[PDB]
Design a protein around this ligand. Structure first.
Ligand SMILES: [Ca+2]
Ligand SMILES: [Ca+2]
Ligand SMILES: [Cl-]
Ligand SMILES: [Cu+]
Lengths: 17, 303
């Protein structure tokens, strides 16, 4: 899929700055 | 894992615990997958023979009505309520609902919605009045373990989940066999159409379905493929299970440490053109306090 498809959205993933 | 709870664990009999569960006898099965299109980072392989001790497993994912009874009895507050938001699929957010600017990298279809939680799965203004027998969603791994412990149960290991979901078939693609819609019949609730733009709802549902939808597998389990992702006990890795040892082949528990817990089964959002993760060997993970509109759980128990 360009990088591995994502099915599990994590709370950690939205933290960025 | 050592959880902390603010409710006492009630006394329950073996007969009460086993209601709605099926007994999986001890024995071996072939775990894992070797589809050449599997994503390497998912670690579906190797295929291996695993021996499991006898266990019980729920026929159905835990429902809204059941989770509501747990909350009524304990006062339990879910992770999504503590954080104040949870993940909702973009097509299910009603226009005007307050939404966060948050971005899940690579997955813009996920929306962080203040006030979305198990009883209001699309955010403020939504409810579960018409979904008592749908799987509970917006439950984190912590919430699932709390429910399971209150119920006298536990989460299945990945191997237990997969043995039960395979339903007595040896290395079939799906719980029921190798064809996705044998005899032209939908057998699970996944996406049809063009992901993430348009779900045609050919299988009857563009969101969750009741926990008893579709035919069961050969062991009597419903919606192991599709509907909602299901939390398992194990820490995630892509390669711990590549080792050949008693720890990885007899009642395997997964690695002792990790950052995300395993989820199995795929959901109403999965599709062959994107993730292809509704095959029974498929696997992914999520961090244990995370929650989403497509993730729930079923329980296991020691007889
Ligand atoms: Ca569907
Ligand atoms: Ca499932
Ligand atoms: Cl219902
Ligand atoms: Cu998926």
């Amino acid at each position: 899929x360009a990088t591995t498809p994502l099915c599990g959205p994590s709370r950690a993933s939205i933290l960025s700055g | 894992h050592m959880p902390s709870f603010d409710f006492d664990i009630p006394r329950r009999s073996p007969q009460e615990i086993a209601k709605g569960m099926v007994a999986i006898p001890g024995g071996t099965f072939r775990m894992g997958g070797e589809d050449p299109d599997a994503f390497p980072e998912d670690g579906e392989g190797p295929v291996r023979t695993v021996r499991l001790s006898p266990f019980l497993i729920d026929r159905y994912a835990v429902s809204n009505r059941q989770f509501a009874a747990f909350v009524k009895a304990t006062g339990y507050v879910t992770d999504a309520e503590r954080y104040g938001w949870s993940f909702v699929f973009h097509a299910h957010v009603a226009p005007g609902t307050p939404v966060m600017d948050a971005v899940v990298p690579e997955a813009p279809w996920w929306v962080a919605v203040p006030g979305a939680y198990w009883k209001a799965p699309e955010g403020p203004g939504s409810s579960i009045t018409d979904r008592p027998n749908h799987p509970v969603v917006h439950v984190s791994w912590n919430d699932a373990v709390a429910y399971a412990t209150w119920a006298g149960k536990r989460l299945p290991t990945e191997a237990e989940w997969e043995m039960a979901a395979r339903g007595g078939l040896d290395q079939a693609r799906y719980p029921w066999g190798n064809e996705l819609t044998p005899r032209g019949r939908h057998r699970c609730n996944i996406w049809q159409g063009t992901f993430p733009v348009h779900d045609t709802g050919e299988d009857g549902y563009t969101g969750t379905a009741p926990v008893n939808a579709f035919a069961p597998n050969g062991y009597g389990l419903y919606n192991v493929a599709g509907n909602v992702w299901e939390w398992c006990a194990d820490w995630w890795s892509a390669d711990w299970h590549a080792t050949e040892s008693p720890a990885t082949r007899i009642d395997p528990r997964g690695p002792e440490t990790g950052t995300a817990r395993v989820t199995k089964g795929g959901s109403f959002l999965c599709h062959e053109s994107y993730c292809n993760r509704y095959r029974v060997a498929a696997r992914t993970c999520n961090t244990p306090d995370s929650s989403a509109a497509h993730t729930g759980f079923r329980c296991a128990a020691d007889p």
